[PDB]
Amino acid sequence: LKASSLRALKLMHLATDDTDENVIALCHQAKTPVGNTDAIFIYPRFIPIARKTLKEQGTPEIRICTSTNFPHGNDDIDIALAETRAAIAYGADSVAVVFPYRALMAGNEQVGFDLVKACKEACAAANVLLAVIIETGELKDEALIRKASEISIKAGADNIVTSTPGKVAEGATPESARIMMEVIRDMGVEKTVGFIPVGGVRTAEDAQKYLAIADELFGADWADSRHYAFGASSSLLASLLKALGH
């Protein structure tokens, strides 16, 4: 439980609305007595001040993740793309674009493909990772979750993500995480696509079990910081630190 808790802590993308003050506190929160989270997750406009804060406290390696087409997942590619370009300009390490899940649910699979592909173009050129949030809690159905993951991967997603941080009453479940990870396995893209459960993981016990699914599916070496991340907040961090004696 200690080994798993330290491992999970180091995979966290820590999130808190964001304000200058909140974000500064978040950066400090990411540097713990036992090590640093891999990243923080914030709105694009706070990327410059977070980068400064991280540098000043001597943790320049803590990455900054953000989101676009957020939180609604509308089907306007031009807007999603503009937002993604802006996120890149602010200095994002990764952009998580929200998939147009309502469009998919209405039977339009093409727009999700074109949207993700356009954003991936723009991120790849800037050496920024593109994650895709499919919003499993809105899709609900296994087939829709599989299809959104597949479309996302075919369009070039670097990571597939369950849910939008903070989405009321919606988060990763062992079932959705399993489905999404099976898509990665089945499509043969484990080297190039990672997974991010957002929500659903509140305890050290939870984190241990989630990682066990990853280790089971892909072997124990797979879920490094590039291929797995816990998108979570203070509750999980606190639980992990307690498991570790803080």
Side-chain angles (χ1 to χ4, degrees), residues 3-140 142-145 147-190 192-246:
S4 63
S5 293
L6 183 61
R7 186 190 179 195
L9 183 151
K10 294 173 74 63
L11 296 171
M12 283 190 73
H13 288 186
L14 185 70
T16 289
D17 303 334
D18 289 344
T19 67
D20 274 1
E21 291 76 14
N22 284 26
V23 165
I24 287 165
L26 185 64
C27 295
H28 296 333
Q29 192 184 27
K31 182 187 189 182
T32 91
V34 308
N36 301 328
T37 65
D38 182 57
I40 61 182
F41 176 90
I42 61 183
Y43 296 149
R45 63 187 180 280
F46 298 113
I47 292 169
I49 190 59
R51 187 73 77 186
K52 181 166 196 283
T53 303
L54 291 168
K55 174 180 177 160
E56 315 197 306
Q57 71 177 21
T59 66
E61 79 276 20
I62 298 190
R63 296 167 98 249
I64 305 167
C65 299
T66 189
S67 184
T68 62
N69 206 30
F70 181 92
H72 306 157
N74 289 339
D75 63 2
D76 189 321
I77 300 162
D78 297 336
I79 288 180
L81 175 60
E83 294 183 334
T84 298
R85 298 192 153 139
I88 289 167
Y90 276 125
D93 289 308
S94 167
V95 176
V97 68
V98 185
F99 193 85
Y101 55 90
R102 286 188 307 279
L104 174 63
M105 288 166 72
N108 181 345
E109 300 186 351
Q110 190 56 44
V111 64
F113 180 89
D114 291 338
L115 193 151
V116 168
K117 182 175 177 165
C119 295
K120 171 56 181 294
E121 189 181 12
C123 280
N127 311 299
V128 169
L129 289 182
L130 181 81
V132 180
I133 293 167
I134 64 162
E135 206 70 283
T136 55
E138 291 291 331
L139 297 172
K140 286 159 174 173
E142 166 173 11
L144 276 170
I145 288 177
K147 175 59 70 181
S149 297
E150 286 171 5
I151 295 173
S152 296
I153 284 168
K154 293 192 178 183
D158 298 310
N159 281 309
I160 53 173
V161 183
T162 59
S163 316
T164 242
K167 178 70 159 189
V168 170
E170 295 180 25
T173 70
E175 303 100 300
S176 58
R178 184 171 293 277
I179 288 158
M180 291 178 70
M181 275 193 291
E182 290 180 2
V183 180
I184 295 173
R185 182 200 60 194
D186 293 352
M187 293 185 70
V189 302
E190 68 270 13
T192 53
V193 179
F195 171 64
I196 306 186
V198 173
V201 188
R202 297 190 57 186
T203 64
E205 288 77 16
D206 286 334
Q208 192 178 33
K209 69 163 185 276
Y210 265 69
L211 286 171
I213 298 175
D215 290 352
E216 158 190 351
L217 272 168
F218 298 110
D221 300 322
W222 183 75
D224 55 22
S225 65
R226 166 65 177 89
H227 298 84
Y228 205 96
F230 286 108
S233 199
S234 298
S235 174
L236 180 61
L237 177 62
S239 180
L240 297 170
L241 283 174
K242 207 186 212 78
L244 293 161
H246 302 83

